[PDB]
C-alpha cells in the first residue's frame, strides 16, 4: 500500500482502503456470514462477497472495528519499525497514517510502500492490543526521549500563535480566558496582541 | 475502543501474565459458557475481557479459582 | 511541554495532549498562511564592499 | 516508568539500536589554556 | 558481555586440560566442583576476547551460528564432533517453528523447562 | 434525484452541565457541514440580543489607579467579575442596581437591590473580594438591551457581552449512508454563560437566521 | 521464489476436501464423505458403487440409509453437482438447482425421469406416444434439458499433452515439397 | 525582469495576493504566493502498486506462498522484522507468522475451519521447510534425526 | 505546452522523430485524421514522379511500457508548408514542442495538515477538465499448439458455458472489436482436444442425449486475468502456410 | 430583534449573456459576508443542471480509432461535445440528432431544433469535416443531474443495455462555475451605518440569476428549518 497522510485519524488509528479489506478478513466474513443465517452454503456466501452486496459492507464495517492490524516499512531497523493502529475504513487506494508516527517509521510520503498483517487468534490480537500498540511506544527504547516529536507545520503554528509585533489590536484589553478564542474569530484583537490580562486557574 | 493499556498493566505488573489471562480468559468467553461480568457496550470478547481485567475481578487467581470450582462441582 | 505532560500526568492526558496538539496547529497553520517568495530572503547590501 | 521485567531479550533490544543510526561519514605540551579558577 | 565469553585455562583444575570453554561454563565447574567436594583443584583462567565475526562461532549449538558466516564448515564439523543443540537459543526457536522463550511465551518454555525436571 | 436533499434526522444531543452541551448530527450532504457550521457559529456569536452591564459609578476616583479603602481588591478585577455576571431583564429597558452590605466580606449578586424584572441566574457569584473591616461600598451599575457586542474603548466604560454565549466550535468528519462515504457529519459543541438553553439559543439563531433569508426567496414553496 | 515451481490446483477433488473441511460433519461422516471423495472420477460421476463404499467402509454401523444422506449431502457441498453415478440423478439435480419457473419444467422432469431410453434412441414418436406429451411443444423442453450441463465435474479438470515430438520436417518451398 | 513584466499584466511586483479561506470565508494574513507551475505526473501510479491477498496458490517445493503479484501472490518478512517482533516479546505473533501463514500444511487448513467456526484457536504443526532442509541434508553423507 | 521553457524543447521534439516531419513540401492538398497528402511544388519537384507525398499516421498502437503512442496533425487544409516543417504532433507535443504534463494553478501554504511533508492537494477542478488522465494498452496473446491428440481449434463451441458469456464472442470466438471486458470474460474461444476412449456406455449414452461435446475437447478458452477491465482496441491473427482456417482472417 | 430590516433582491444587473452582476438591500453588520460564503458555497455546490450523457453514432465504433474525412480524433468531439450548453423544458432525458455533409465547419447552429432544446452558444465546434464525401450522422442525449457525475459510477446502471456502439461521457451539471461576492457600505442615511453585499456571478447562460440565487436561498432553508425543533 501507498501511503498519505491522516490529518485527522487520531493517533491509535490507521486508514485501511476497503479495496484491500474484504480480503484480508474475507475468511472471516465467512464466518459471520454463516453466523447470520445470511449465507445457508459456503458457495452462496462466496457468491454474495464476490457480488459487493450493501449488507457485505455492513458485515465488515461491524467485524473490523474492534481488531487491530499492523504495519510495517519496507527496511524496518530499530525497535519501532513495526507497529499495530485501529483500522478506519476510507474509500480509496492508500493507506493513510498518523501524522506523528512518520517519525519513527522514518517515513517521507513520497512514493513509498508498507506491509500489513492481520493478526489472527485472540492472544495475537492481544500482545497487538498491549505492546505493539502506539499508545505504549512514547519513550525511545535507545536514550529515553520521547519518540513522538513534532517537527513540522504543528511547530510553525504553533510559534506563529505564540508572539507579538508590538501591539495588535487591542493592546489594553483584559478578558478571562475563555474570551480569547471569541474576540480572535469575530473581531477586537489578534493573537498577536500584547499586553494582553486574564486571569489563569 | 480502548485506548490504552495501563490499568490492568498497573494490576498486573509484568506486563506478559497480563497478555496470558486475558489470553485465558477472552478464549473461556468465545467458546462460549460464561457469562460477562461486565456490562458489554457491543464490544468484542477482547476489550470486553481487558476493562474487567482492569476494573479489578478477574486475574490468574480468581479464574483459576473458579476453574477448580467448577471442575470439582462435576 | 510534551516531556513534563508525560512525566506528571501519565499516558492518557499527554497522548490526548499531543493529538490535541497536533489538531490546533494544523488550524493554525492553514489559518496563518505563512507564503514565501523572493523578497522574503533579504541580501544585505553590504557584500558589495565586503567581495 | 518501571524496573525492567522478566522474560525479555535484552540483547535483540540491544544490537538493534546501536547500528541503527547509519549516518555516519566514510572516506576518513606549551599550549595549555584554564577556562575557570 | 557478548565479547567477554571463551575464556582460556592454564592450569588443568581436574575439568579438562583442554582451551576454548565457556566462561560461564567454567564458573560453574569452579562452583559446583570447588565448593562441593575439592576446593584444591583450582581452575586459572585467561578472560580472552573474540570478535564480532569469531565470538559468534563459538557457540554450544550447531543449529545456530551457521546461517552467520558459513555452514558448510559448522556441517561438517558438528558432523565429525556430533553435537546436540536442545534448541537452546532464540533462532534455534525460529528454525523449529515453537513458543520462543522471551517475552509471553519465556513463562510457558520456563514451564517446559520445570515440565524436563521429572518427565 | 433532481431537488431531493438528505435532511438531518439524528438530531441526539448529550449534555455533561446546564451550561455545556455537545450536539451530533446524521451524515449531510457534501461541503452544507462546513458552511452549516461557519454560518451558525458567527451568526451565534456576533449578533445574539441580551442584557448586560455596561458601566459602573463606585465612590471614589473615576480613573483606573483607584485605590482600596478596604476593599483591598483593585476595581480592575472587581470590574473583571462584574463581567461575568448574567443579568436578565424581561420587559424593562435601561435601567441602574445598587447594593449596599456589612463587613463580613463574600460580596455574592444577592447584594444588589431586587428589581422586578431584574434577575440573577446564580446568586453566589462574586462581585467584591473579602472586605477587611465593617466598611461598606456602593456600585451603581447599570445594564442595558442590545445585541451582539461591543467594547467599551469606543462605545463607553467596562465592557458590553450582549451575546449570552460562552465558546463555540463545530467539527466535520466523513460519514456514509449505505455505500458512498462522502457524507458530512456535523458535530457543535458550545458553552453557555447561563439563563438560556444551548438547545434553545441554536434554536434562537437557526430562527434569526431563518427570518434573515426569508426575503430572499420571494415567497416560495407556498404548496 | 520466482524459480519456477509447481503452483498447486484444485484438481477437481481439492475443491471438495475443502467443501467437507468446511462444511459440519461427524467424524464418521467425514470419514464416509472422504471416502465419497475416493470415489470421484474428472467426468465428476462416482465410480464406485454405493454397496462398494459400504464394504470399503467396513462398519457394522455403516448402513446404506448415513451414506446416502452423505452423498446427498455431498452433491450439493460443492458448486458443480457431482457423484450423481447417473445421467438421470446429474439431470435431475441440475432440474433441481433450475428455478421452478421454468417453460415445460414438469415435462422435461417426467421425461428425464423414467423416458431416458426414448430420448437416448431419439423416438420422438415413442416419446410423444408414451408421455403424451404435447406435439413440437415437447421440443422445448428437450432444448431445456439438452443445457443441463452433462458431466459438471469435467468443467474442474483441465490438462493438456502438449507434445508430439516430431522427427521429420517436410513442407512447401519454391512450389517444391522438400523434406 | 520578471518583476518589470508583471507591470505590464498589471499583477502585484511583489508577487503575493491575498487569499480568503473556503470554508470560513475570512482574510487569510501574510498574503500567499500563488503561481502557475508546470507539474507532470510520474510512472509510479497506484493502480499497479497495490496488492492485497488472504490465500492463494502455493509452491510444491517448501510449500511456500508465492510472492510478488505473479499469479496473486503473498508478501515477504524479513529477518529484521523478526528482529523487532522477537524484541517486543510477541512471540505468539511469531508463532502465527511461522506456522500458520507459512508451509504448514497441516495448519491452514485448521486455521481456515476454526476462523470460519469464529474459534480463533491456534494448532501449531510443524513446518514443511525444515522437513525439506532435514532430507536436503541427509542427501549428503550426513545423518540428521530427531530425538525425544 | 509549458508556459516556462528553455528553448531546447522545439529541437528535442523535432529530433527524437516522434513526429512526422515534412520533407519537400510545397502545399497540402487533403487532410483526414489518419492521413496526410502534400503537393510538393515544381521548383522541389524532380522529373520522373507524379509530385505528391503521403504520409500514413500512428493510432494508438502500444508501447514498450504499455503506454498508448499516438499523433495528432496540426495542418487543416489548403496550408502552404515549406521544407523541414512539423505536421503531426506526437505524445506529448503540441506544435513541434515537447510537452509533458499541465500548467496547474499553485498556492504555497499549510492546509489542516494535508500538504504536511511532502503531500499535494489536488482541485475537483483538476479531476473534472480530465487534466493528467493516462490512457494505457495492455496485449494478450494466445497460441494453439498442435498436440498428439489432435489439433486446437477456435470455434466459440465451449461446453460449460453460458450464453450469455458467449453474447460477446462472434463466429470464430474472437471478440468484436471496440467491445467491453471486465473479470474474467472469455475473449479467444480455444478448445483443447482429448483422447478417444471405449466404448464407455455412460459416455456413449450420453453423446446419444446432448452430443456435439462428447467430451472431446476441454475448455482452454482465454479469459481476463482478475483485476483488469477494459475495452478491446483490435486483435490480429497470424496464421502458418500450409493451413487456411481463417474464418474470420 | 429590534428591527433587522429585511434586505430584499434589487437592481438585478445583467452585464453580458453569461456574466451578471446581483445586489440586495442594505443588512445588519454581521452578516454580510457570511450570507456571502453561505450563498458561494451553495451556488457552486448543488445548482441543477443539463449536460450530455451518452453518445450514440453509426459511423465509428468505439472511442479510440478514426473516420475517414474528419479532422480531430473522436475523443475530441467527446470532449467538445462535453462542454455544450443547452437548456431544455420540463421534461427531461431528450434526445437530438445531428447530421451534416459537405466541407464546411460543423457547429450548433445546423442541429434538429426541437420545442424543448434551446442552444445558448450556436458558435460551437463539433470537429468541422474535411472531405466533400464525409457525411456524419450521429445523435446526443441531454439529460438534467446536480452534481458531478464520472462514467464509471452509472456502468451499474446499464448492463444489458448499452450495446456495442454507444459511447459514455462524463457529467458535470455544474452550470455556473465561477461566482465572487464584496461586502460594501453605502445607500443609508436615515439610520446607521449599513453594509451592501453585492454578488458577481459568471455562468454558462442556461440558468438565469434571479433563479439560481432563490434555489439557493431555497435550499439552505430547506435544510436549515430541521434545527428549529
Same mark, same amino acid.
Given at each position: ?201 | ?74 | ?51 | ?37 | ?5 571463551? !575464556? ?6 581436574? +575439568? ?9 561454563? +567454567? ?15 583450582? !581452575? ?16 554450544? +549449538? ?19 564432533? *556430533? ?37 | ?223 | ?151 459438471? *465435474? ?26 | ?148 | ?94 506544435? *513541434? ?85 471486465? *473479470? ?66
Amino acid at each position: 500500500s501507498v501511503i498519505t497522510v491522516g490529518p485527522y485519524l487520531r493517533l491509535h488509528q490507521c486508514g485501511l482502503p476497503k479495496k484491500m479489506a474484504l480480503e484480508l478478513f474475507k475468511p472471516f466474513i465467512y464466518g459471520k456470514l454463516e453466523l447470520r443465517g445470511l449465507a445457508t452454503t459456503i458457495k452462496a456466501a462466496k457468491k454474495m462477497v464476490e457480488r459487493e452486496e450493501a449488507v457485505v459492507w455492513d458485515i465488515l464495517d461491524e467485524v473490523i472495528r474492534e481488531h487491530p492490524v499492523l504495519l510495517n516499512r519496507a527496511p524496518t531497523l530499530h525497535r519501532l519499525g513495526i507497529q499495530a493502529f485501529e483500522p478506519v475504513l476510507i474509500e480509496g487506494k492508500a493507506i493513510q497514517l498518523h501524522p506523528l508516527v512518520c517519525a519513527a517509521y522514518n517515513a517521507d510520503f513520497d512514493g513509498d510502500q508498507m506491509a500489513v498483517h492481520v493478526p489472527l487468534t485472540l492472544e495475537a490480537q492481544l500482545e497487538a492490543r498491549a505492546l505493539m500498540m502506539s499508545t505504549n511506544n512514547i519513550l525511545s527504547p535507545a536514550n529515553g526521549e520521547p519518540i513522538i516529536v513534532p517537527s513540522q507545520d504543528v511547530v510553525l503554528g504553533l510559534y506563529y500563535m505564540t508572539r507579538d509585533c508590538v501591539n495588535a489590536k487591542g493592546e489594553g484589553m483584559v478578558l478571562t480566558g475563555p474570551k480569547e478564542a471569541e474576540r480572535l474569530y469575530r473581531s477586537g484583537l489578534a493573537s498577536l496582541h500584547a499586553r494582553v490580562k486574564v486571569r489563569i486557574t | 475502543a480502548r485506548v490504552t493499556v495501563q490499568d490492568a498493566v498497573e494490576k498486573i505488573g509484568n506486563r506478559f501474565d497480563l497478555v496470558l489471562v486475558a489470553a485465558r480468559r477472552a478464549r473461556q468467553m468465545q467458546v462460549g459458557g460464561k457469562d460477562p461480568l461486565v456490562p458489554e457496550e457491543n464490544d468484542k470478547t477482547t476489550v470486553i475481557a481487558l476493562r474487567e481485567i482492569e476494573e479489578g475481578l478477574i486475574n490468574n487467581q480468581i479464574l483459576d479459582v473458579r476453574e477448580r470450582q467448577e471442575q470439582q462441582e462435576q | 511541554m510534551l516531556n513534563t505532560c508525560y512525566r506528571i500526568l501519565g499516558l492518557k492526558p499527554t497522548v490526548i495532549f499531543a493529538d490535541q496538539i497536533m489538531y490546533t496547529g494544523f488550524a493554525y497553520a492553514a489559518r496563518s498562511g505563512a507564503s514565501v517568495g523572493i523578497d522574503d530572503m533579504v541580501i544585505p547590501e553590504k557584500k558589495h564592499e565586503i567581495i | 516508568g518501571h524496573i525492567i521485567n522478566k522474560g525479555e531479550a535484552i540483547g535483540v533490544i540491544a544490537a538493534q539500536s546501536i547500528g541503527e543510526p547509519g549516518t555516519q561519514l566514510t572516506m576518513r605540551e606549551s599550549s595549555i589554556q584554564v577556562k575557570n579558577k | 558481555r557478548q565479547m567477554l565469553r571463551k !575464556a582460556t585455562i592454564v592450569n588443568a583444575g581436574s +575439568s579438562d586440560f583442554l582451551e576454548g570453554e565457556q566462561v560461564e561454563y +567454567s564458573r560453574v565447574k569452579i562452583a559446583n566442583r570447588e565448593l562441593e567436594a575439592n576446593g584444591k583443584v583450582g !581452575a586459572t583462567y585467561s578472560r580472552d576476547l573474540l570478535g564480532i565475526t569469531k565470538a559468534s562461532l563459538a557457540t554450544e +549449538s550447531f543449529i545456530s551460528a551457521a546461517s552467520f558466516q558459513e555452514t558448510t564448515r559448522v556441517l561438517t564439523e558438528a558432523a565429525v564432533a *556430533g553435537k546436540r543443540d536442545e534448541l537452546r537459543g532464540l533462532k534455534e526457536n525460529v528454525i523449529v517453528g515453537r513458543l520462543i522463550p522471551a517475552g509471553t511465551g519465556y513463562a510457558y518454555h520456563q514451564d517446559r523447562m520445570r515440565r524436563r525436571a521429572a518427565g | 434525484s433532481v431537488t431531493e436533499f438528505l435532511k438531518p434526522r439524528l438530531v441526539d444531543i448529550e449534555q455533561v452541565s446546564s451550561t455545556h452541551a455537545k450536539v451530533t448530527l446524521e451524515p449531510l450532504e457534501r461541503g452544507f457541514g462546513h458552511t452549516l457550521g461557519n454560518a451558525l457559529r458567527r451568526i451565534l456569536l456576533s449578533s445574539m440580543p441580551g442584557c448586560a452591564v455596561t458601566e459602573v459609578e463606585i465612590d471614589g476616583v473615576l480613573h483606573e489607579y483607584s485605590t482600596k479603602e478596604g476593599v483591598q481588591e483593585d476595581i480592575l478585577e472587581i470590574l473583571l467579575n462584574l463581567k461575568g455576571l448574567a443579568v436578565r431583564v424581561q420587559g424593562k429597558d435601561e435601567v441602574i442596581l445598587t447594593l449596599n452590605k456589612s463587613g463580613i466580606g463574600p460580596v455574592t449578586a444577592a447584594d444588589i437591590t431586587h428589581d422586578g424584572d431584574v434577575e440573577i441566574v446564580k446568586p453566589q457569584h462574586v462581585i467584591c473580594h473579602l472586605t477587611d473591616e465593617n466598611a461598606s461600598i456602593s456600585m451603581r451599575i447599570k445594564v442595558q438591551r442590545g445585541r451582539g457586542y461591543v467594547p467599551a474603548s469606543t462605545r463607553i466604560l467596562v465592557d458590553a457581552c450582549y451575546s449570552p454565549v460562552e465558546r463555540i466550535a463545530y467539527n466535520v468528519e466523513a460519514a456514509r449512508v449505505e455505500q458512498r462515504t462522502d457524507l458530512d457529519k456535523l458535530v457543535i459543541e458550545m458553552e453557555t454563560n447561563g439563563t438560556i438553553d444551548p438547545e434553545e439559543a441554536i434554536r434562537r439563531a437557526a430562527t434569526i437566521l431563518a427570518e434573515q433569508l426569508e426575503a430572499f426567496v420571494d415567497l416560495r414553496d407556498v404548496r | 521464489l520466482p524459480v519456477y515451481q509447481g503452483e498447486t490446483t484444485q484438481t477437481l477433488q481439492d475443491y471438495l476436501m475443502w467443501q467437507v473441511e468446511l462444511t459440519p460433519f461427524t467424524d464418521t461422516d467425514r470419514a464416509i464423505a472422504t471416502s465419497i471423495v475416493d470415489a470421484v472420477d474428472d467426468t465428476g460421476y462416482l465410480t464406485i458403487q454405493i454397496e462398494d463404499i459400504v464394504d470399503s467402509i467396513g462398519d457394522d454401523e455403516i448402513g446404506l440409509e448415513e451414506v446416502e444422506a452423505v452423498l446427498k449431502r455431498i452433491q450439493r457441498f460443492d458448486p458443480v453437482g457431482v457423484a450423481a453415478k447417473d445421467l438421470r440423478d446429474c439431470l435431475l439435480i441440475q432440474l433441481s438447482q433450475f428455478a421452478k419457473e421454468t417453460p415445460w419444467l414438469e415435462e422435461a422432469r417426467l421425461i428425464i425421469s423414467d423416458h431416458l431410453d426414448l430420448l437416448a434412441n431419439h423416438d420422438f414418436r415413442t416419446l410423444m406416444r408414451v408421455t403424451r406429451l404435447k406435439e413440437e411443444v415437447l421440443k422445448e423442453a428437450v432444448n431445456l434439458i439438452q443445457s443441463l450441463d452433462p458431466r459438471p *465435474g469435467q468443467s474442474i479438470q483441465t490438462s493438456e499433452p502438449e507434445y508430439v515430438i516430431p522427427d521429420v520436417l517436410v513442407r512447401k518451398v519454391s512450389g517444391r515439397w522438400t523434406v | 525582469e520578471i518583476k518589470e513584466l508583471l507591470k505590464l499584466g498589471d499583477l502585484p511586483t511583489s508577487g503575493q495576493i491575498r487569499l480568503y479561506d473556503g470554508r470560513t470565508g475570512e482574510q487569510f494574513e501574510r498574503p500567499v504566493t500563488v503561481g502557475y507551475m508546470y507539474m507532470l505526473k510520474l510512472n509510479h501510479l497506484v493502480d499497479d502498486k497495490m496488492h492485497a491477498r488472504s490465500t492463494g496458490s502455493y509452491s510444491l517445493v517448501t510449500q511456500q506462498p508465492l510472492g510478488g503479484k505473479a499469479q496473486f501472490g503473498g508478501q515477504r518478512f524479513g529477518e529484521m522484522e523478526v528482529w523487532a517482533l522477537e524484541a517486543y516479546g510477541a512471540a505468539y505473533t511469531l508463532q502465527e507468522m511461522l506456522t500458520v501463514k507459512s508451509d504448514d500444511v497441516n495448519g491452514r487448513t485448521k486455521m481456515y475451519k476454526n476462523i470460519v467456526d469464529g474459534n480463533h484457536q491456534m494448532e501449531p504443526g510443524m513446518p514443511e521447510s525444515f522437513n525439506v532442509l532435514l532430507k536436503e541434508i541427509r542427501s549428503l553423507g550426513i545423518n540428521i534425526e530427531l530425538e525425544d | 505546452k509549458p508556459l516556462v521553457g528553455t528553448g531546447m524543447e522545439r529541437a528535442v521534439a523535432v529530433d527524437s522523430g516522434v513526429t512526422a516531419v515534412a520533407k519537400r513540401g510545397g502545399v497540402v492538398q487533403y487532410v483526414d485524421a489518419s492521413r496526410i497528402v502534400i503537393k510538393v511544388n515544381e521548383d522541389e519537384m524532380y522529373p520522373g514522379e507524379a509530385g505528391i507525398d503521403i504520409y500514413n499516421l500512428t493510432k494508438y498502437t502500444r508501447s514498450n511500457q504499455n503506454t498508448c503512442i499516438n499523433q495528432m496533425p496540426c495542418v487543416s487544409l489548403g496550408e502552404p508548408v515549406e521544407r523541414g516543417d512539423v505536421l503531426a504532433d506526437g505524445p506529448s507535443t503540441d506544435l *513541434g514542442e515537447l510537452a509533458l504534463g499541465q500548467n496547474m494553478r499553485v498556492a504555497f501554504m499549510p492546509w489542516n495538515g494535508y500538504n504536511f511533508e511532502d503531500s499535494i492537494l489536488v482541485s475537483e477542478r483538476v479531476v473534472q477538465e480530465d487534466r493528467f488522465t493516462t490512457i494505457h494498452i495492455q496485449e494478450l496473446a494466445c497460441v494453439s499448439r498442435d498436440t498428439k491428440l489432435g489439433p486446437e481449434e477456435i470455434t466459440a463451441d465451449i461446453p460449460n458455458v453460458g450464453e450469455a458469456a458467449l453474447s460477446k464472442l462472434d463466429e470464430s470466438g474472437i471478440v468484436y472489436i471496440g467491445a467491453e471486458v471486465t *473479470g474474467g470474460d472469455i475473449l479467444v474461444g480455444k478448445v483443447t482436444p482429448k483422447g478417444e476412449t471405449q466404448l464407455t456406455p455412460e459416455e456413449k449414452l450420453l453423446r446419444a442425449i446432448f452430443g456435439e461435446k462428447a467430451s472431446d475437447v476441454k475448455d482452454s478458452s482465454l479469459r481476463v486475468p482478475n483485476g483488469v477491465s477494459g475495452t478491446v482496441i483490435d486483435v490480429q491473427v497470424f496464421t502458418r502456410d500450409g493451413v487456411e482456417k481463417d474464418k474470420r482472417a
